[PDB]
Design a protein around this ligand. Sequence first.
Ligand code: CTP
Ligand code: CTP
Ligand code: VE6
Ligand code: CA
Ligand code: CA
Lengths: 224, 213
Amino acid sequence: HHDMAGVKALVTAGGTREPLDPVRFIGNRSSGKQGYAVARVLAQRGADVTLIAGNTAGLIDPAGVEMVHIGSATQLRDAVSKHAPDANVLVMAAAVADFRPAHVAAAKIKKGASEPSSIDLVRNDDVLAGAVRARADGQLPNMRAIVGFAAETDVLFHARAKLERKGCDLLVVNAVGENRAFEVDHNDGWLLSADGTESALEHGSKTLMATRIVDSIAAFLKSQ
Amino acid sequence: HHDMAGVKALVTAGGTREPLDPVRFIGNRSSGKQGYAVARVLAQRGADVTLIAGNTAGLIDPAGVEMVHIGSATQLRDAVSKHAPDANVLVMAAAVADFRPAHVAAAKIKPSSIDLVRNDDVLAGAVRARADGQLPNMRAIVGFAAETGDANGDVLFHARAKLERKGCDLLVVNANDGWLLSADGTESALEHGSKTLMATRIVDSIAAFLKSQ
Ligand SMILES: Nc1ccn([C@@H]2O[C@H](COP(=O)(O)OP(=O)(O)OP(=O)(O)O)[C@@H](O)[C@H]2O)c(=O)n1
Ligand SMILES: Nc1ccn([C@@H]2O[C@H](COP(=O)(O)OP(=O)(O)OP(=O)(O)O)[C@@H](O)[C@H]2O)c(=O)n1
Ligand SMILES: O=C(O)C(=O)c1cn(-c2ccc(O)cc2)c2ccc(Br)cc12
Ligand SMILES: [Ca+2]
Ligand SMILES: [Ca+2]
């Protein structure tokens, strides 16, 4: 079934890198492979896909997908607000850094002979929350589904609450792990819809979870 | 020819990541490509190579090279001190982080500034160790640097200062050229080329410095 034909979808993936200076930064360990798989499965099921990607250099660009490359969280926010009016579906699978260094040095900071000094942090904008607001303010008339991602350690108490605070249509919880040897199986993956259905997310390959996420989107797209 | 036969070489390459927590870290933008190429060229020319590898661009382990994967600079220091007594050549091509977070969370942290503590200088520790008779097999210690000229001095002034302050035998300086600065005062331009070909010039320098003796 090519159930995503006629659907224009925008995906973010990978972690952001918040510059401290031209060489150093604060980043996170997200590989981006899971957002890549969602974009790959969407493209394979007929969607017109644009992928905004962060620290994902060694990944293969998915076939049939339009690539937009960013580095920072603010660049991701700026890139999403550009490509979002055209989308029917937003998939926020990127590990957006919640904070960035408050000051960026123009040159690399030389090692002192005396005490080092801290990196002051500043909040980055909530790209998911901004998109949800834009839609509610009538600014995204094409947006049919907004999908968020979360890593949670009940699970549903934290998961159900993120859904209400972000306000998106679906929250993918704990789609983490490659199902690799000696990675903990917390039987914790859930597909949380704003309508209140909970689906369990079988911790399997990145491809199978992507199929589950895209199954859920098309089913949410048909509910309306 | 196989001019590096009989030589045990210990190489660091890539940047380190200093954890804040299981997800976040302080990192740098070093790709590691030039240390890997140095490790690849040394092996091909007969050396027994151990490559201590940190964060890379997704690089494949060079064939025939013993790989040690590290994450942090502290882990990198432990790995170097563990393998150094056996080595004849140390090539410090890793972008070792100067500072690390003062606290590491075991779980993910949901204004605070990040307090930092200084990391050990592994290249300098190696130079002092050799001079203290603790590394009798060490024949060459090679450091790496990327230097710019600025309001405080030109590129070459800053690079020489690095060699003089680090005390190593050879300093491979990037300014896409740069220089090869030797402890005898020899300064060669580093002709730009591929990572492979520039690695060839670096090893030729090491070989030529090994014949110094
Ligand atoms: N500055 C941010 C931070 C996160 N996100 C998005 O919001 C979702 C939730 O990410 P999460 O890591 O849970 O961050 P927070 O919800 O802000 O909370 P916490 O940092 O406590 O985990 C993710 O899909 C991410 O793409 C975002 O758009 N902008
Ligand atoms: N904690 C550190 C920092 C640097 N290095 C090594 O030292 C050499 C020089 O790196 P560089 O950062 O240029 O020297 P620094 O004194 O840290 O330079 P600066 O103060 O300008 O940042 C490199 O081979 C690197 O592998 C190291 O062994 N341990
Ligand atoms: O490995 C790579 O990808 C790479 O290109 C290089 C990294 N550094 C580097 C290492 C640690 C440091 O502290 C400063 C600079 C280099 C220095 C000279 C040349 Br020539 C090349 C590199
Ligand atoms: Ca977050
Ligand atoms: Ca430094």
